[PDB]
Design a protein around this nucleic acid. Sequence first.
DNA 1: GCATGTGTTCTAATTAGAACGCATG
DNA 2: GCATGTGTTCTAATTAGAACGCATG
Lengths: 291, 291, 180, 192
Amino acid sequence: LYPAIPAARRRPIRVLSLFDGIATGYLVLKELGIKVGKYVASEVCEESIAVGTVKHEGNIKYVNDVRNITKKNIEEWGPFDLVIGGSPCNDLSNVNPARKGLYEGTGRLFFEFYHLLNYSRPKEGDDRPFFWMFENVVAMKVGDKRDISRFLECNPVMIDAIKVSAAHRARYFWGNLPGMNRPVIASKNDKLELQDCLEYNRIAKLKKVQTITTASNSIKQGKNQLFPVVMNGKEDVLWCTELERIFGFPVHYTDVSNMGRGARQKLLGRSWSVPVIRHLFAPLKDYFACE
Amino acid sequence: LYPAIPAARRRPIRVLSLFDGIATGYLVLKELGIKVGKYVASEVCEESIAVGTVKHEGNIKYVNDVRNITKKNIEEWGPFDLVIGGSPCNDLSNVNPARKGLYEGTGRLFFEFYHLLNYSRPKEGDDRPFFWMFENVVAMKVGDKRDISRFLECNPVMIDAIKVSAAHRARYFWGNLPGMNRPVIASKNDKLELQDCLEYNRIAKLKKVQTITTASNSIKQGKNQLFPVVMNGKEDVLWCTELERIFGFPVHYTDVSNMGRGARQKLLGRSWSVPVIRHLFAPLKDYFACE
Amino acid sequence: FETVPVWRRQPVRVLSLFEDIKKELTSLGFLESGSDPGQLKHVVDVTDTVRKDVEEWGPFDLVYGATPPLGHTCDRPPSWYLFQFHRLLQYARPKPGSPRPFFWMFVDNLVLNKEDLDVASRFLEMEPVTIPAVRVWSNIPAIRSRHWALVSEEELSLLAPTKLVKNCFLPLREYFKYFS
Amino acid sequence: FETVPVWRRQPVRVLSLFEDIKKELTSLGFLESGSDPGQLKHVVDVTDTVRKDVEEWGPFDLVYGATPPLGHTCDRPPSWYLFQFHRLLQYARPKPGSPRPFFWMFVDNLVLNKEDLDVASRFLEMEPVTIPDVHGGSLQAVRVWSNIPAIRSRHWALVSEEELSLLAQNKQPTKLVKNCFLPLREYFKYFS
DNA sequence: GCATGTGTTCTAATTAGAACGCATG
DNA sequence: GCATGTGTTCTAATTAGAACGCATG
Ligand SMILES: Nc1ncnc2c1ncn2[C@@H]1O[C@H](CSCC[C@H](N)C(=O)O)[C@@H](O)[C@H]1O
Ligand SMILES: Nc1ncnc2c1ncn2[C@@H]1O[C@H](CSCC[C@H](N)C(=O)O)[C@@H](O)[C@H]1O
Ligand SMILES: [Mg+2]
Ligand SMILES: [Mg+2]
């Protein structure tokens, strides 16, 4: 473990977030009561940046493409107390038949996280606190999960969002955060079943929904593709605000940039389950200021 | 004209709302602090009703198409202390060169309001309180404004949202509400300039915007037809949440039914300006219960 | 509306809109011949008529509405005649307490579209009866009472007032003075 | 890295990966003709090698990376060789207080494309230096990234990429080894 | 034994952008 | 003395929804 820091020696956390998406990391941290000194986000999707900008009112320093971040940039924007990233799984997840593996296409962006993590690691002889975490899909080739573990010198613990959300979401988590293997337990404010996420006058046909992707087809459940909701006797798909509640995001979190149904789902389908990230970041409260 | 009621003899208000739209009437009434006993809404647009039910959690009884309301219906669902409505103006406004007057097309739906208003009036010798109000666009043929005034036996009071909104919106208001002719004055929470309605990191070029219509062209100001907003140095149109704040609606009021930008603008474009309706309904809290 | 003894049947008081039926009405003897001021009021255009006008025009016993029959040109939309007709009747109907029998009728020359028919019936609170021709909505009991020949819509295809039309006025004589 | 006096030059301790260069290092005179163990380790299937492994293999003076020469021996994607090379390089650096000179180099037999080139330069914190070895003509070229000063100090014959693009297919190393391995015995022991 | 998935592509519907319109302060 | 407007229409992209895919508890 890392030495405990007395409550008074704690100082606000300085985070480097790569592939920040819709700023889930920042959202979790401030909903967790942790004072955020600095949040440096690498993201290239204009709609994603739009969300993190508007919902967090400019506390996030955006840093466009991760591949233009230099060793000088890490020392300038540093130091960093936390480095978090989720690499694109367009060419890693088994949901895509034409995936190009870890070393071609979008999968090789993993190594940018590995590269910039070592630039950010404290130099030998400085055991100041330092935490990192990397996330990806469980549905990847065995050679990829093996090689990712070799570069990170670590083995992943899997957490499925289904224990804290209303949705199946099984994801791997490499890292060094305190108590990552700790047993997952729910909260008294986790919307555990789909009915808890719907709005007035809508009925949930299931208690938990299958894994939500970017495409609109993962909203129809199973091999008989039934709409997960009934409203006024008619079958219907989920709503954007309902997808948000499923993921643990605050409602209307993606009501940005004139985005329609398809756009919000593409951003939500790629993100992290908020209550799972809450699980992982929770022991960081004992190492950083709280206001 | 009508005598005041003592505070304890006041009962909750019973309102029949025709062409309810997105339930602006109910919204302003609840935001005024008025106890709403019954709100019977005639509306036939699916996503409009979706908004009303979801945002108001089933307190509104929807009674589909107005032309299927019977004399029996008015006396069953009645009595009513308030009757409000604004008919479709796509065949009355000057913005459509292919208008059909109020005797053909959809303009004939005005007479439905006239005809159902007579049903709702208290019979001769019943000195109980009764209020009505009807809205439409000022940009109508003089012959139409004449005939409407004849049937309602009243002359309209034009109110422009410009003095309480951030938008030009000039409309006529037939009715018998207390103090309609009075000068309108802004309030503290009224967002008077466009920059008060925009999101973080967005710059407004004007202080007021031209009249919002259903089409996305009404948002480009003037003969130059330019994007009323700049963000990140690039020009951009308004956002659905910004359109909402312009009209005085609660932000995210139209984040319903997987509606995109165009859908939400169609509903807001034909709506009432909330602060204008608040100005009109404000003297009603002296005749009905408050909670 | 009960029947009235013959010795107390006062003369009619008619409001005729869009048609001068004075000639057609006097024929069946409801109007005293010659300069009878308070027997029939006629208004051709009504777009500026206020309720205070028809009240000042004395109370009325019958309100008659009709549209232009096979007119070469009508300067007004077809629905306009019904809407302005319903507007004035509410002005002309007396107090809730009924001093006497008050009647009304509207007459269509088959110039209203089917969309205008269903709104006509909704406003006049009854479905029309056809007199073989012309469709009429009316308060009179004895034109929605008895015998009438049943014709179909195939008869209105080919169609596209001395005795037939007046047959829907005779039952009003049982309620007012017969002048002979 | 200042130069070392001749009486203080040890033998190299070379880590070689994906390609065995013992025949070349012994030739230029850095390794003993007979070694009881050896001064040069060589691995190919590196997918399963840990940091604890390369530390257990003693400290290292040079780490040499290479891609297989142009041929049909491409069983793994081209980027795989650099990424694994960078992974092991960080395992093989000594403590921050440098006891001795530590050099590294990575060579490419023109197997990496543009996208793979720019990612190679970002990770190695250096953009490559290429060698022609074409004294006869356009004859048999390899891009090298290297810590070695004289590799990136003296500039030799340049060549246009428009001509370097066509020669990539030309295959369908006495001078090359001599060119850049040479200025390493100004730091290590010379055996002959 | 058999149902599932941080996606792509194809094809079909549906939707954005602006021209259009001219009475009227 | 020019500019504005509770909309429609037409055209051109921009989608939406489902087929596709199969290693693996
Ligand atoms: N070259 C690049 N540099 C930085 N970000 C990139 C990138 N290429 C793709 N991305 C972004 O990386 C993200 C990975 S999806 C992960 C999103 C994030 N974990 C969340 O909670 O939402 C995507 O949003 C994608 O836009
Ligand atoms: N036949 C009918 N019966 C009831 N409502 C109708 C109707 N035809 C059209 N409408 C509705 O009448 C509304 C007029 S737009 C007015 C909206 C409302 N005043 C608001 O504040 O939002 C439209 O929403 C339209 O859907
Ligand atoms: Mg771990
Ligand atoms: Mg008035």
